[PDB]
Amino acid sequence: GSSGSSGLDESVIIQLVEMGFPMDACRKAVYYTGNSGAEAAMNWVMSHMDDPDFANPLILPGSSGPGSSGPSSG
């Protein structure tokens, strides 16, 4: 019939991930957007990606030991 699955939509995530994006981030869009199509999800991504804190994982429980540097020049 139809791939129920329920709870978020991986099919969308997969795609994005296939486009060359971080799953987590992909899971962030859908999540935040609350699963409302790829286009919508993407947008959120297209907006988030704008920042380098896009790939980063979901909010952490009070960042304690972060592991990021970010080189100014390349």
Picking from 63, 26, 70, the residue whose alpha carbon sits closest to that of residue 48 is 26
User: Distance between CA atoms of 10 and 8, rounded to whole angstroms?
Assistant: 7
Task: Report the CATH number at residue 28.
Answer: 1.10.8.10
User: What approach was used to elucidate this structure?
Assistant: NMR
DSSP secondary structure string, the chain? ------SS-HHHHHHHHHHS--HHHHHHHHHHHTS--HHHHHHHHHHHTTSTTSSS-S--SS--S------S--
Close Cβ partners of 74 (under 8 Å, ≥ 6 residues apart):
none
Side chain identity, residue 30: V
Are 27 and 54 in contact, with CB atoms under 8 Å apart?
A: no
User: Distance between CA atoms of 73 and 18, rounded to whole angstroms?
Assistant: 29
What radius of gyration, in Å, describes the C-alpha atoms of the chain?
A: 14
C-alpha neighbours within 13 Å on the C-beta side of residue 49: 13
Tell me the residue range of the domain where 35 lies.
10-51
Picking from 42, 41, 35, the residue whose alpha carbon sits closest to that of residue 9 is 35
